[PDB]
Amino acid sequence: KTYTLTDYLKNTYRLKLYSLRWISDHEYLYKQENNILVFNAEYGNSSVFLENSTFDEFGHSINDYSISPDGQFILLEYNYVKQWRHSYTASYDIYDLNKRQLITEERIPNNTQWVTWSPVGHKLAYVWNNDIYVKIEPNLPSYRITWTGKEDIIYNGITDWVYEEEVFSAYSALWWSPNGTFLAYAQFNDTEVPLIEYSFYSDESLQYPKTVRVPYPKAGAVNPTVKFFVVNTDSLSSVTNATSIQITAPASMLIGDHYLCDVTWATQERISLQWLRRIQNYSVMDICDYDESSGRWNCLVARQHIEMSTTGWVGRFRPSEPHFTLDGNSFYKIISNEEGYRHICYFQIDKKDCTFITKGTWEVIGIEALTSDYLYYISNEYKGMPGGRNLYKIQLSDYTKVTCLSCELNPERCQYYSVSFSKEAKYYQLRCSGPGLPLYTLHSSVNDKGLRVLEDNSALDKMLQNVQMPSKKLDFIILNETKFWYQMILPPHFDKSKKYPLLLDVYAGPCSQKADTVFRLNWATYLASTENIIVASFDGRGSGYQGDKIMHAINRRLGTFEVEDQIEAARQFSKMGFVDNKRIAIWGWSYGGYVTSMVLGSGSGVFKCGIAVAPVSRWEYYDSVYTERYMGLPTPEDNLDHYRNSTVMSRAENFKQVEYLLIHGTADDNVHFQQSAQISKALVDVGVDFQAMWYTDEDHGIASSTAHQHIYTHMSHFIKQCFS
Amino acid sequence: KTYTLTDYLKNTYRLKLYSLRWISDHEYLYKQENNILVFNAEYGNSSVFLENSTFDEFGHSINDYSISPDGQFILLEYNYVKQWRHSYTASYDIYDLNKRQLITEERIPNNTQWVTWSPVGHKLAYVWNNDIYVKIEPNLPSYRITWTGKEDIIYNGITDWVYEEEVFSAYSALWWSPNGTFLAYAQFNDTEVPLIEYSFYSDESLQYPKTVRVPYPKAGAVNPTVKFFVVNTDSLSSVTNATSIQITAPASMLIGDHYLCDVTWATQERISLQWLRRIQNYSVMDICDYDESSGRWNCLVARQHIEMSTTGWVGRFRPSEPHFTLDGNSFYKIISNEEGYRHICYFQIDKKDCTFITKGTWEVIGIEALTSDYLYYISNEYKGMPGGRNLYKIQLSDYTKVTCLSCELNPERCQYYSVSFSKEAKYYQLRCSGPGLPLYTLHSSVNDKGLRVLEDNSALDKMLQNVQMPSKKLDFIILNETKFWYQMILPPHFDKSKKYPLLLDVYAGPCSQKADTVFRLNWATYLASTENIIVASFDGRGSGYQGDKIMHAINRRLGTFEVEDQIEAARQFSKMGFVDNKRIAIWGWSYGGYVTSMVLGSGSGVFKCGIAVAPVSRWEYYDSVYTERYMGLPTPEDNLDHYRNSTVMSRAENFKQVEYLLIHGTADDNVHFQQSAQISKALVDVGVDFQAMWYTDEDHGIASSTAHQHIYTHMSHFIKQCFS
Ligand SMILES: Cc1cccc(-c2cn(CC[C@H](N)Cc3cc(F)c(F)cc3F)nn2)c1
Ligand SMILES: Cc1cccc(-c2cn(CC[C@H](N)Cc3cc(F)c(F)cc3F)nn2)c1
């Protein structure tokens, strides 16, 4: 027997996670059956912290919970209702743990946009009708910090669409100070930002389709504007509209259009900000101190740091976040060095220069933890593989004393690690994601002994010995004087002498990685396992984690190299001779659907067919923060030329040579139906036949249970047919 | 060689028309090459009336012309820009024929909604920004009759969406009196009518899709309201806002929601109106006289005639129009008699009863002309075939003296006639549409001698002897004690002993006729001629021209009998044994996409596959005037039950048994994309795979040159594949 489509769609073979949240420097919470336990890492003893039956009469299905850091209250999120990618609304009840009662006085209102405890104690900040509210005690009246909030226009403590998706990667635009004194929050004015309008159809009952209106800046459109504020949460008059002290931006930003692009507190009275120019090659960091006499905030022009690039844009998707030392007089931050590799730079608050505390022909991925002794960072250094991911520690007193904590823990089973440290970094969890089965283990920082194995998925391991799994090959090939990685999913019993049909699975977007050591059970597993199809991927130019020379190659050039390298990557898989070069296909979502579409439109004749799911078809239709970061402005002085030269529509003719399946969700707020509807029109105009499928009311994920099954079923038929 | 798809899509074999407009009782205008001639029917001589080169320096491509009845001016329509089905906007220049100059003073404004001469002389009424304007002389200032016009809200002299499509079948809501004294006009208030909102995507250039908003009453929603007015076009103060004398409705109408449903002038000072209840089983005619002393209008309660039905709705799609005798004291009107057959009733203005001047088991189609001696009517009496159409005359002095003027003119070539009479009915054109090649001939009423053959399409006839045409069989079958007509397009050399694959071509709507004697060169021609496929059609219950017993069968029952009869019709075609009963398909547009969808969802297992093009999926989504005319109100007291029991969505499951192609234009204002999008969602919910195709910016006709070709190409592959 074999890994079938239903196996994938019905999820018959489960991967197991181990999901914990650290509540102290030695205690974390795990959920079990329905009980919330608390595992003491020190001894190993675990205690029922909350019992499955504690909420049987609660009367509502509970979507999420949040426990106040001081263990005194638990937040109960129910009535969840997704909005965009990270945003949603909900209702909230607070339960008193000291007692055993749900607070009925001054409750958090229905339809709340965001909720959060202070990092210490049990204060609540919560946004509602676009306005911030603070609650020092669960049962007491709430101090309404903001008054200006207005639907689709003013955003207080929450991001508008473009800031949510493309900048902060969350819905929440607020930030407590490390002890809970100050509530930093940002403000978004969307007044002159244009609306995207699309239909929502709803239940068959709904007689007129709703029109959905979203402030969405397409490329070169009018952006939102931001203002930043800080509030003292202590001095809160039960009888005066609280004073929000605005920090303004540097004057190098205030000349032109800008985005606030990071908010990191350093100390109890020192906050750092990072600003980005609308042209995203120039960033500025500010450090703002609290002047205890004036109640104001002061950002010294001598404490400013500038980050800029000449070969492309600043950061991977934004500038990295700083990691301040206990005192808050120095920080660590990832930057690309002179050779273009993202490493750790050591900064003194008021010194313009930094010191690199790593270098190499590889990249730091992220700074994970910082003690007085150690900085922990994840990097793809080990075995020189960029698809890999490991935990290291560097000695703060000695920059040449680097230990790899994970490299050797299980060499064969484990090459992709992520880490979760406890408060003050006493203990850490290591998550292994491949190439073997996921493996979750606990560790103490002190001497690095492996206390316990929390999850090894042996349960699944048993189940899979009965199933003909595909194998995964990860390797590289040299194109110029650069090595480019690829990965194949090989059908079980892979006979290198036969000729297999290949499916080129595509993303390709700037700073992507589709070739890694991760263990996945997805659609490709089924395509190899059962249909004996090689599903390949290739991280050519534009892609991440291999230094700026590669990643910035597509600067102001989207839809060129990344596209051509994908074709090349296919030519080469044919030169390996286990590939039926008359049955090569291509497929992709989001950016990858664009690249898929661009490829079929190239008339390279390498490819028989392709599926583009929710593709971008023309950069001008995509949002500004993303598009511009790579292409600049679409005016004839900036880059309007490459904008006009890189559409799927102009390659319409060549589709005559291919079989094409274009699939789009009608209620995609992210890559709007328009992109796909302009392609279809284009093809129809030049008399190209193709295949289409819309998905009513689906968004960019086409992720509803039934549509997920439908789309994948539909694509399989398409692929099968295409390949006989 | 054979009739191929391209032959149909590139229109290589042309049918020729003969398009003339009568300007007198003996002269008509024909266009030739680019010259407008005038053929005198009296002698036969023809003269250049306007020369092809008269407008070479005109500077604009001329979409249409209109010549004033008194030969003095010609109206020049250019910059045409389609709106809905009949509606559009344009610009207009007026050219003086007496002289040779384009009037430059007081020109008709850009973006005019409607324009028309008075029936006599050369006055102009023209609607613009929703308001009426009169012009007694081309060069003189225009008297603005209305002031209340407002976009999407107030319609003066033009119909709103639902009145255009479903009532008057034109854009123009105005009516001159027979000599040009009075301008009758209607007014539409759409204030509380709900909007349909859909996207338009436009040229690739357009960066945000436009949202299109249209006042559109779905079933049971708030209807537009109407008021009627008459103006004296002579007494027009170059210094006073002209007085519009409102006629109001009967009081039997004013109790509830109503529509104005006909406007026929009787004499120079007597206008007739017809009113319809929102429940469309009750009509009332009014006759309104001009009181020369009061300047008012008076509709005598004794001159009212009531039209109503108990077994269904009044009229075929509306009540028929009256035909008033010279004096205006009697009129002729078509009504169904006691046995349910539409015949001519003779009415005296103030007498409640009428006299039937025809009876039979067949129907009058329309009253074409009326003299002091004769009434001319078209009917399907000849050979007892309802798919036929003939010209007859009845003697006004003797109701038993009926002559058929066409029946015998060419029995084999000619069984479908239409007629165009000259002023006072001195001469007429006969248009033969099948079953042979279209034949256009001229005739004098006086003794009925056939002056000349104007067009015989012998040019095409030559061309087609070289091509393997399909033959067409029209016949009937008995189901209960009723005979139901069907037609087959049979592949050339049709061997009755073989087993052919059949495609059931569906419309099926209330009062439809898909089985007739007409000669067509369409898609079916290609399917039979080249793919040797039988393309059948069948007019079962609900269908027109065979009396109320059949047509009213579906009253309050849409999506039942008409649907079941179509399945039946296919069972029976299998019993004829030349049909491969494992390769039967079904297809349909508009209503027929609905019926096609209902059938596949019936699980009758007769049908392998089907194509539904722009179907209705649920009656509550279609406009009110149509839907209600057949189903009543969708409230639980009226008919909400049949409404909820007749959706395509509830048959979702059964689609498992079929192969389905659903095709819809995104910018369909008539059957909104919602209808299709609710189907696709329904199918995806029960995990049925199917095939889809949207058409960017196309409407209900998918009729742009490139989309037309694309859709039909696409459906062919589908059909071919479905049939191997
Ligand atoms: C692994 C990792 C870590 C942190 C940030 C990110 C990340 C990923 N992204 C992508 C955001 C962007 N909206 C993706 C996107 C690209 C398209 F081209 C498109 F059409 C739609 C998209 F959502 N931004 N930041 C990824
Ligand atoms: C031959 C002839 C003479 C006069 C009027 C008409 C006539 C034809 N029609 C059809 C109009 C109707 N809206 C068609 C239609 C039906 C549907 F069910 C639908 F979903 C969409 C449509 F356009 N109404 N009146 C036909």
Swiss-Prot record, chains A, B:
Gene3D superfamilies: alpha/beta hydrolase (3.40.50.1820), Dipeptidylpeptidase IV, N-terminal domain (2.140.10.30). GO terms for molecular function: aminopeptidase activity; chemorepellent activity; dipeptidyl-peptidase activity; identical protein binding; protease binding; protein homodimerization activity; serine-type endopeptidase activity; serine-type peptidase activity. Changing residue 110 to A: Does not inhibit dipeptidyl peptidase activity, interaction with ADA and homodimer formation. Keywords: Aminopeptidase, Cell adhesion, Cell junction, Cell membrane, Cell projection, Disulfide bond, Glycoprotein, Host-virus interaction, Hydrolase, Membrane, Protease, Receptor, Secreted, Serine protease, Signal-anchor, Transmembrane, Transmembrane helix. Inhibited by GPC3 and diprotin A. The soluble form (Dipeptidyl peptidase 4 soluble form also named SDPP) derives from the membrane form (Dipeptidyl peptidase 4 membrane form also named MDPP) by proteolytic processing. N- and O-Glycosylated. It is found in: Cell membrane; Apical cell membrane; Cell projection, Invadopodium membrane; Cell projection, Lamellipodium membrane. Changing residue 45 to A: Does not inhibit dipeptidyl peptidase activity, interaction with ADA and homodimer formation. GO terms for biological process: behavioral fear response; cell adhesion; endothelial cell migration; glucagon processing; locomotory exploration behavior; membrane fusion; negative regulation of extracellular matrix disassembly; negative regulation of neutrophil chemotaxis. SUPFAM superfamilies: alpha/beta-Hydrolases, DPP6 N-terminal domain-like. It catalyses: Release of an N-terminal dipeptide, Xaa-Yaa-|-Zaa-, from a polypeptide, preferentially when Yaa is Pro, provided Zaa is neither Pro nor hydroxyproline. Its main location: membrane. Disulfide bonds join 288-299, 345-354, 404-407, 414-432, 609-722. Changing residue 189 to A: Does not inhibit dipeptidyl peptidase activity, interaction with ADA and homodimer formation. Changing residue 281 to A: Does not inhibit dipeptidyl peptidase activity, interaction with ADA and homodimer formation. InterPro entries: AB_hydrolase_fold (IPR029058), Pept_S9_AS (IPR002471), Peptidase_S9_cat (IPR001375), Peptidase_S9B_N (IPR002469), Serine_Prot_S9B/DPPIV (IPR050278). Residues 1-724 are extracellular. Expressed specifically in lymphatic vessels but not in blood vessels in the skin, small intestine, esophagus, ovary, breast and prostate glands. Not detected in lymphatic vessels in the lung, kidney, uterus, liver and stomach (at protein level). Expressed in the poorly differentiated crypt cells of the small intestine as well as in the mature villous cells. Expressed at very low levels in the colon. Cell surface glycoprotein receptor involved in the costimulatory signal essential for T-cell receptor (TCR)-mediated T-cell activation. Acts as a positive regulator of T-cell coactivation, by binding at least ADA, CAV1, IGF2R, and PTPRC. Its binding to CAV1 and CARD11 induces T-cell proliferation and NF-kappa-B activation in a T-cell receptor/CD3-dependent manner. Its interaction with ADA also regulates lymphocyte-epithelial cell adhesion. Belongs to the peptidase S9B family. DPPIV subfamily. The extracellular cysteine-rich region is necessary for association with collagen, dimer formation and optimal dipeptidyl peptidase activity. This is Dipeptidyl peptidase 4.
